[PDB]
Scaffold this active site. Structure first.
Site, PDB file in Angstrom:
ATOM      1  N   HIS A  14       0.950  -1.371  -0.002  1.00  0.00           N
ATOM      2  CA  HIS A  14       0.050  -0.179  -0.102  1.00  0.00           C
ATOM      3  C   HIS A  14       0.685   1.203   0.196  1.00  0.00           C
ATOM      4  CE1 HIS A  14      -3.939  -2.099   0.948  1.00  0.00           C
ATOM      5  NE2 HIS A  14      -2.807  -3.058   1.448  1.00  0.00           N
ATOM      6  N   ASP A  16       0.034   4.229   1.019  1.00  0.00           N
ATOM      7  CA  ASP A  16       0.003   4.953   2.043  1.00  0.00           C
ATOM      8  C   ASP A  16       0.334   4.213   3.291  1.00  0.00           C
ATOM      9  OD1 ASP A  16      -2.232   3.327   1.595  1.00  0.00           O
ATOM     10  OD2 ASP A  16      -3.849   4.610   2.381  1.00  0.00           O
ATOM     11  N   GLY A 181      -9.597  -2.539   3.307  1.00  0.00           N
ATOM     12  CA  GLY A 181     -10.042  -1.590   4.515  1.00  0.00           C
ATOM     13  C   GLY A 181     -10.544  -2.851   5.578  1.00  0.00           C
ATOM     14  N   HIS A 211      -8.965  -8.063  -1.214  1.00  0.00           N
ATOM     15  CA  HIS A 211      -8.354  -8.499   0.246  1.00  0.00           C
ATOM     16  C   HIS A 211      -9.351  -9.559   1.026  1.00  0.00           C
ATOM     17  CE1 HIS A 211      -5.762  -5.178   0.226  1.00  0.00           C
ATOM     18  NE2 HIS A 211      -5.067  -5.504   1.337  1.00  0.00           N
ATOM     19  N   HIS A 235      -3.976 -12.085   0.678  1.00  0.00           N
ATOM     20  CA  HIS A 235      -3.698 -13.014   1.873  1.00  0.00           C
ATOM     21  C   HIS A 235      -4.399 -14.331   1.620  1.00  0.00           C
ATOM     22  CE1 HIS A 235      -2.463  -9.299   4.105  1.00  0.00           C
ATOM     23  NE2 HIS A 235      -3.512  -8.697   3.697  1.00  0.00           N
ATOM     24  N   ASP A 292       3.074  -5.387   2.141  1.00  0.00           N
ATOM     25  CA  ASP A 292       1.910  -4.918   2.572  1.00  0.00           C
ATOM     26  C   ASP A 292       1.886  -3.404   3.078  1.00  0.00           C
ATOM     27  OD1 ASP A 292      -0.862  -4.911   2.868  1.00  0.00           O
ATOM     28  OD2 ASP A 292      -1.012  -6.110   4.790  1.00  0.00           O
ATOM     29  N   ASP A 293       2.397  -3.152   4.433  1.00  0.00           N
ATOM     30  CA  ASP A 293       2.363  -1.814   4.922  1.00  0.00           C
ATOM     31  C   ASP A 293       3.845  -1.755   5.700  1.00  0.00           C
ATOM     32  OD1 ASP A 293      -0.703  -0.672   4.589  1.00  0.00           O
ATOM     33  OD2 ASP A 293      -0.395  -2.699   5.234  1.00  0.00           O
TER      34      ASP A 293
HETATM   35 ZN   LIG Z   1      -3.252  -5.053   1.986  1.00  0.00          ZN
END
Ligand SMILES: [Zn+2]
Length: 349
Positions: A14, A16, A181, A211, A235, A292-293
């Site tokens: 992501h 962000d 989300g 997701h 995932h 992922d993040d």
């Molecule tokens: Zn994700």
């Protein structure tokens, strides 16, 4: 000593959740917008996680810093550019990066994200700005970068707009639509706005990821595959709980975008048990490894590779296999996909 010092492909990361703390600090100062810390180490310690929580508790970390980035044209373009630099250093040669354009906008978006005052940055403008930074990064750092736009589970009123932006920016640089989300929102996969966007995607040949089975039941994965008609599953760990569904998806060569370190920190994976990716590996499944993040997880792609190498018996052979599968499952047009595969085979000799 890197776990896999060869070219990699990353399909699930992501934008962000992949911003430099230094850049967040920079824009908080410049804009005069509150951040929960004044040093980069302290900022990392509050935004970041080093023990498992929950999906919603993870999602709350964005509240700390998204306000300094959203609605700011310079910042939006800059995070895109610095993203490519980040990934180039990791040995990534192709990446698809995703984000919600609505969550970075301050105009023509309802409800207004992050309590912003109306500005001039529409969700369309966000995509344009990201494109610019990604394309400049590609030029500067010599890796290929494409983007994916996220529908948000709690806000199906944005989903048709997301679809239209994917059409408008098709392959320049948007290659697909995602649904992201809070997966714990009961039945959110089948909210009519999301179903309409995905069905429109099918009719218009816009690629699809979703997701599913991160924290949700196998029914979420079923919803994604059979109604949303997803082409890859974000995932997918809990698919294994419905053996028949899991075996069907193996047979269909479904791609799973696996995020091992993420799965530990969000609680998606119960660390008391063998990770789902071990089963995937043993069944010779179609899957990729992904950060992922990385901002929130305090990680790089090497974190996920080191984890699977040390704890899950991953070999160089399997690292090659999964990156080739990632390339095959990418949303690149045929010719560019062949180019990527040629490059991987060349550099893997
Ligand atoms: Zn994700």
């Amino acid at each position: 000593t890197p776990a896999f010092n060869k070219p990699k492909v990353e399909l699930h990361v992501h934008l962000d959740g992949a911003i430099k703390p230094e850049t967040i600090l920079y824009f908080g100062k410049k804009r005069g917008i509150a951040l929960p810390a004044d040093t980069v180490e302290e900022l990392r310690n509050i935004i970041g996680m080093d023990k498992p929580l929950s999906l919603p508790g993870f999602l709350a970390k964005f509240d700390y810093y998204m306000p300094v980035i959203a609605g700011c044209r310079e910042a939006i373009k800059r995070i895109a550019y610095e993203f490519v630099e980040m990934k180039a250093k990791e040995g990534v040669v192709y990446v698809e990066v995703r984000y919600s354009p609505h969550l970075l906008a301050n105009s023509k978006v309802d409800p207004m994200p992050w309590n912003q005052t109306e500005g001039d940055v529409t969700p369309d403008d966000v995509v344009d700005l990201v494109n610019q930074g990604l394309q400049e990064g590609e030029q500067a750092f010599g890796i290929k970068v494409r983007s994916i736009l996220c529908c948000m589970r709690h806000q199906p009123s944005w989903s048709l707009e997301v679809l239209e932006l994917c059409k408008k920016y098709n392959q320049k640089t948007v290659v697909a639509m995602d649904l992201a989300g809070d997966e714990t929102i009961e039945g959110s996969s089948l909210f009519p706005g999301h179903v309409e966007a995905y069905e429109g995607a099918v009719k218009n040949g816009i690629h699809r990821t979703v997701h599913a089975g991160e924290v949700g039941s196998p029914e979420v994965v079923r919803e994604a595959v059979d109604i949303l008609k997803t082409e890859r599953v974000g995932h997918g760990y809990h698919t294994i709980e419905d053996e028949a569904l899991y075996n069907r998806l193996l047979k269909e060569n479904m791609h799973f975008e696996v995020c091992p370190w993420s799965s530990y920190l969000t609680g998606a994976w119960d660390p008391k048990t063998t990770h789902a990716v071990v089963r995937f590996k043993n069944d010779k499944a179609n899957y990729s490894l992904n950060t992922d993040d990385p901002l929130i997880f305090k990680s790089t792609l090497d974190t996920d590779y080191q984890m699977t190498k040390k704890d899950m018996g991953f070999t160089e052979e399997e690292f090659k296999r999964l990156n080739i599968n990632a390339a095959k499952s990418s949303f690149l047009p045929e010719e560019e996909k062949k180019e990527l595969l040629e490059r991987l085979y060349r550099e893997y000799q």
